[PDB]
Write a protein that binds this ligand. Structure first.
Ligand SMILES: N[C@@H](CCC(=O)N[C@@H](CS)C(=O)NCC(=O)O)C(=O)O
Ligand SMILES: N[C@@H](CCC(=O)N[C@@H](CS)C(=O)NCC(=O)O)C(=O)O
Lengths: 225, 219
């Protein structure tokens, strides 16, 4: 049976799975769950994923409720032996380490900021506080890239797919002027054909946030190529 | 060389790694990083881990900066063919999915609550708000346990090691009386020889939080 992806493309971790699906030409059925309309609290979706989060994948009997498990599962099933989720143990641990950085640090901080805008309205958010927390994530990713061309080594891996979507979301608000390696890496990701899967949801998230939060992102911040 | 574990046993993800190390008899060199003195910001540790977090594992040239990668790495290198990190793909993805639940949901929410204490003082924290967020996590784990004795199936896995330490930390503040499956699972986890690895750090966290929070946990 073909994988079923419950999704809202405004979500960065959803867009990471959409990028992998495009990169590998995976046939997947998409089922939209509108997060800003609260459809993730619908009783049948809650029964499927009590964390009420997207992406959720159903593939046969398997139900995955975290983008990072979804990326790993799809790579193992549709890129066997590939370099996205590498075969050598130490290389694979490095990718796993960076996936968890995305989950535990970069996404956590971007979610904290964006959730505050939705709950409080932009004018009531302590933007300076979130600028510090997210610039700290920029600094860390800049350090990762001072060693390798890609986040987890010399070539594109699942870590880049996970990180680039949330990075593009942070960068709607906060500029990358001071981060040359991060800008070089982001520019290169934007040249990838798979990056087309990030574009639509990023823009829909931009429009939704500006509406619900009653503000405008500074147009000069976002890196476009 | 033997793995090096940078740790502060007050950290629940540290304690998860300590439990696995004891369960598998792994010979490791422990290096204490006092989080309450800010030693995670010392220049050499920051150079090692820019996220300034424990646990951090150095194993040869490999540097891991997240407990969930460390658990998987140590299981793969020291417990090949074990049940903690199952070899069958569907079972392994199930364990991975629960490891990420611990990272993304349970630990996130407990960390939000504990950080609010250290920042604001216990007397100023919106306790009811965090009670709702953390009770929601209890409700989810209770459902995870409906058809299995452990978090990811009929056997103990890495998911149980990761979740039990944070669970015990949430349980400093919020009791398990209303969750029969979760309470029975936690009691069973406490019978493990390896659970002794959780005991010392949990009580150190209690004592440290209560002094800095100028409060006492209801437990
Ligand atoms: N760590 C999880 C994070 C998933 C997550 O929190 N998704 C957000 C959207 S970016 C969501 O579904 N929010 C809906 C809700 O929490 O109710 C993953 O990587 O999939
Ligand atoms: N997702 C990470 C979380 C690690 C983490 O946040 N550890 C806390 C202690 S519980 C820490 O080191 N805090 C110090 C700091 O953030 O400066 C993991 O599982 O290892």
């Amino acid at each position: 049976p073909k994988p079923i992806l419950y999704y809202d493309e405004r979500s960065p971790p959803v867009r990471s799975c959409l990028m992998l699906i495009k990169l590998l030409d995976i046939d997947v059925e998409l089922r939209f769950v509108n997060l800003f309309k609260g459809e993730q609290f619908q009783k049948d979706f809650l029964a499927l994923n009590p964390q009420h989060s997207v992406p959720t994948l159903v593939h046969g009997d398997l139900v995955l409720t975290d983008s990072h498990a979804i990326l790993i599962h799809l790579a193992e099933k549709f890129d066997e032996g590939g370099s996205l989720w590498p075969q050598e143990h130490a290389e694979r641990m490095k990718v796993l380490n960076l996936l968890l950085f995305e989950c535990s640090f970069l996404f956590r901080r971007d979610s904290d900021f964006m959730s505050a805008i939705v709950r409080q309205g932009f004018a009531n958010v302590d933007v300076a506080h979130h600028e510090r927390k997210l610039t700290e994530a920029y600094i860390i990713m800049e350090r990762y890239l001072e060693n390798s061309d890609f986040m987890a080594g010399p070539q594109l891996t699942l870590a880049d797919l996970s990180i680039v979507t949330t990075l593009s979301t942070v960068n709607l608000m906060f500029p990358l002027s001071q981060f040359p390696r991060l800008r070089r890496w982001f520019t290169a990701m934007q040249q990838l054909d798979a990056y087309e899967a990030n574009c639509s949801g990023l823009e829909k998230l931009r429009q939704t946030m500006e509406s619900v939060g009653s503000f405008q992102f500074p147009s000069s911040s976002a890196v476009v190529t």
